[PDB]
């Protein structure tokens, strides 16, 4: 008991998040009861309060965003240095927030995995069944709202099925001092969750030349498949891999913003605003921008430097996609407090080649070949919808003798999946999905008469541009993210066509009007991303 | 239509299959009480200090049964190569020196990792992290361990903490009144072999997955001191949830999980693919660091639920310094997992090289032998690792010449633990060679680093520099840090950068140092058959 000083790794100057605006659930003070046991102050919390909080959290988060997420779209619209595509995407996204704020449609069709970061106090007593009540609140949120069941169960190593409730949830409940119960609810979409990268580097990385080249290199690997502008988060170091990958996501959700900006002899975590700006240079000098070239590739950056083993240096990269969905909350003696989000997003709000898709496919391919890559396109016609699990069955068909089905050859293939349908609505949120995940099917399906035109979001591999030039194909790129405004304004009629047992991932025929898209990969060999990402 | 199903449903959550020993006189730190009809437990927070102290002390000297049962199996198996028996015997012998409680099992005493599960009605005062850190502080300060943590004064300026703090303190909230623990001393090498891959649906088929495992296992190489406890996790709710699950699988925390999934997407062990990984490991021929069958002790494959668009896969290993201890505090006191106190019950050609000659006279002798030749070094070694190279390259990048100590003796990539009383040195095992690969061609172009001594395979950029500059890379046995200090290392002297802890520059006098020629001056590599 001498030269010992304890210093926690994370020492935030606002641990209880006072800078965040909270709203109180009306009549929630009845779910708590202050008691005194062995001289210490405790809080008997009704476990039903965990169900109600998760319900309101995972409901109101799919319709609203924080200020700094909307302040990044408006900045992308008003900044002169933003490309004409930067303003177009940011306006289309900011408009999608207004349609989503109407509480009828979710902000994105990928309602995301239910993630809960709970911190139960030493003297906060709920009965122990915290997970069951929290899961019931998530179960209530996705069953009684126009959300989507996104979780895939594993019956064995390969046989899979959907759960039908967007469960199970990531329930990481921590033990903390005190008697209060603090939360951070996250609905992390699949695309952003897939752009969480772990690199195991060495001491040779720790110098301003190498680290900058590392950032230049790794930021391009994120690409546009996670619907930029991103909230880029970067963590250098850590006590373990999982501690690094957990810290980078909390940085993306902006949980560690109140951390100090200087380290010490005790190895405390700290934000580095110097290199937060250096990260903003790489993002803005990349020219990748808002999905289609420009300056605003990232809303903002968060860089956290952690302690590390003398032999270890794990670094973590992750982003928060355009569907920035996180909510802070806490339960105390005063009741249930939940973070307020911007209810009115319109206050942040201040040439196209009409393509007919009702013509023969080869007559539509001829029209698209008349224009170079980067051409703004407005689709009007029929689209076939199919994604990963639908593709997995058609290749399984062709691997046994069955031919490529006819519906793949008639209309452009729209890599997407619909959310649940509201009452009196033509469809729920029906935004595009990551294109690069179905890259392995392009050359095969094109060799059998179909998939000549594909419609999705995100850059694709070189194997697709090669397959498109050979078979005379195209890859159309929709605006990734605006799933709500595409459902209300653009999508007019939806009809399940094949594999109805697959839920949202079935084969759908949809009639579409005024669908924004860009020609990024043509039948000649050009790619709109080869300048920014290759 | 709501049914709650937790992701992890272990059939032995409290780890009854693990044998626990009670700290004598620990029942005074607990008191069973009854509050609002439910049973609670007042735990003195000083009990957290004693448990963490005892845990991080006895874990550097003893191992579990299945870790020692894997070395004995590697010695007795007929299909094991003569090198498989040699490494497993040298490691198993190293445990006997370490079981003496004077020397740690490995020079890398590892990062202090604690997975605590405090019950809803387990009361400690809230200072669990402080008291757990004090117990870790006592363990590494009052024992012959090593301070492995590096603080960050800014983005690049660094310094050591001098106490092996901070610790990874992951305290979870669980029902009940008990406080259950898992103490881990994760070494650097095994912690650097934690890999996160973002894969797709196209991976989920027996053809792709088997070849995927074949592909990624080669990346582990021998740089993490095999035989490994290979762990593989397919799926997860997030990257961090996957990387957490794979490490617990490496520490064998999820062994009591079911073996079948259900419509609720519960986690489960896949014994079918646990063997498939063991086939690839045994059919790889990489073996115990130098070719053979026993590349891995055992495998653990866990299949998690996943997003319909996500498929995170996790790869991690537990190195030869497999250090984990389970514990729990209840009304009866402090119970801590028993490790094998007597490891000897699991226990059933060299080119003598003089290193006292001029360096070029020692390089000439090594060129007479092919790769894979067993060598016994006898002479002087210069010790330098990651931070020393970063400072010496900084010297040569500003005008200062390559220092004299780099050019005189073979470069020993290692770092010593603290020295016991009346001892020549503490544990002084080798370190991962691949981390100093970026300095070979530079240092060899300026007259030094012609002979390097470490463990683990290196990149092709080093084999080119060795053939070009006429150099060698000697491969020590990775892991036996205690038996190398007692038997092989006879005299140690700090040479430069004494503020760097283990990563300082050391001059050591060495006798009978086992090593293997893996990279010669011709372009050959003994791992090109197994790892390329
Ligand atoms: O595992 C390593 O390579 C590091 C060993 C050390 O701390 O010297
Ligand atoms: S906005 Fe894009 S990245 Fe985010 S969840 Fe929706 S589709 Fe995925
Ligand atoms: S046994 Fe090898 S990998 Fe494990 S800590 Fe020691 S040196 Fe590192």
UniProtKB/Swiss-Prot annotation, chain A:
Gene3D superfamilies, sorted: Fe-S hydro-lyase, tartrate dehydratase beta-type, catalytic domain
Record-listed (S)-malate 1 binding positions: 109-110, 148, 191, 387, 433-437, 457
Alphabetized Pfam families for the sequence: Fumerase (PF05681), Fumerase_C (PF05683)
One GO cellular component, as annotated: cytosol
Cofactor(s) needed for function: [4Fe-4S] cluster
SUPFAM superfamilies the UniProt entry points to: FumA C-terminal domain-like
Binding-site positions, (S)-malate 2: 194-200
Keywords of this entry: 4Fe-4S, Cytoplasm, Iron, Iron-sulfur, Lyase, Metal-binding
GO annotation terms (biological process): fumarate metabolic process; malate metabolic process; tricarboxylic acid cycle
Compartmental location: Cytoplasm, Cytosol
Tagged with keyword Lyase: yes
Predominant location category: cytoplasm
Residues reported in the UniProt entry to bind [4Fe-4S] cluster: 108, 227, 321
UniProt-listed NCBIfam families: ttdB_fumA_fumB (TIGR00723)
Assembly behavior: Homodimer.
Function in brief: Cytosolic fumarate hydratase that catalyzes the reversible hydration of fumarate to (S)-malate.
Protein name in the entry: Fumarate hydratase 2
Source organism phylogeny: Eukaryota, Discoba, Euglenozoa, Kinetoplastea, Metakinetoplastina
């Amino acid at each position: 008991n001498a030269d010992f000083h304890f210093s926690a790794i994370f020492q935030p100057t606002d641990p209880h998040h006072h800078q965040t605006e909270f709203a109180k659930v009306e009549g929630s003070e009845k779910y708590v009861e202050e008691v005194e046991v062995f001289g210490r102050q405790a809080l008997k919390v009704n476990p039903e309060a965990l169900t109600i909080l998760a319900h309101r959290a995972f409901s109101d988060v799919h319709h609203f965003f924080r200020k700094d997420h909307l302040e990044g779209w408006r900045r992308a619209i008003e900044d002169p240095e933003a490309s004409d595509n930067d303003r177009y995407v940011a306006t289309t996204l900011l408009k999608n927030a207004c349609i989503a704020a109407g509480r009828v449609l979710p902000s994105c069709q990928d309602t995301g995995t239910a993630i809960v970061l709970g911190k139960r106090g030493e003297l906060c007593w709920t009965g122990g069944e915290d997970e069951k009540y929290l899961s019931k609140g998530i179960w209530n949120a996705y069953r009684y709202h126009n959300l989507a069941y996104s979780q895939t169960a594993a019956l064995d190593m390969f046989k899979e099925c959907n759960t039908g409730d967007n469960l199970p949830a990531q329930l990481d409940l921590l033990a903390v001092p005190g008697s209060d119960y603090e939360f951070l609810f996250i609905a992390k979409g699949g695309g952003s969750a897939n752009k969480a990268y772990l690199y195991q580097e060495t001491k040779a990385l720790l110098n301003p030349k190498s680290l900058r080249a590392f950032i230049e290199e790794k930021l391009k690997t994120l690409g546009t498949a996670a619907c930029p502008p991103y909230h880029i988060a970067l963590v250098i170091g850590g006590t373990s891999a999982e501690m690094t990958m957990k810290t980078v996501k909390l940085a993306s959700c902006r949980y560690y913003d109140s951390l100090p900006t200087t380290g010490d002899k005790y190895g405390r975590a700290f934000r580095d605003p110097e290199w937060e700006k250096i990260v903003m240079e790489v993002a803005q000098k990349s020219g990748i921008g808002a999905q289609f070239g420009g300056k605003y590739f990232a809303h903002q950056a968060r860089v956290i430097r952690l302690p590390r083993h003398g032999a270890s240096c794990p670094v973590g990269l992750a982003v928060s996609c355009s569907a920035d969905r996180q909510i802070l909350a806490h339960i105390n003696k005063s009741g249930i407090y939940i973070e307020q989000l911007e209810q009115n997003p319109a206050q942040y709000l201040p040439t196209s080649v009409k393509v007919d898709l009702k013509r023969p496919i080869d007559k539509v391919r001829q029209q698209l070949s008349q224009y170079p890559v980067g051409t703004r396109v407005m689709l009007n016609g029929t689209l076939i919808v199919a994604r990963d699990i639908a593709h997995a069955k058609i290749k399984e068909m062709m691997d046994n003798g069955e031919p490529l089905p006819e519906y793949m050859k008639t209309s452009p293939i729209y890599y997407a999946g619909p959310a649940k349908t509201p009452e009196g609505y033509a469809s729920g949120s029906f935004g595009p999905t990551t294109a690069g995940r179905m890259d392995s099917y392009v050359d095969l399906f094109q060799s059998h008469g179909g998939s000549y035109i594909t419609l999705a979001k995100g850059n694709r591999s070189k194997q697709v541009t090669d397959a498109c030039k050979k078979h005379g194909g195209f890859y159309l790129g929709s605006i990734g993210g605006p799933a709500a405004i595409l459902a209300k304004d653009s999508i007019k009629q939806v009809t399940c066509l094949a594999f109805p047992e697959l839920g949202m991932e079935a084969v759908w025929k949809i009639e579409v009007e005024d669908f924004p898209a860009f020609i990024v990969v043509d039948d000649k060999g050009n790619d709109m991303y080869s300048k920014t990402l290759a």
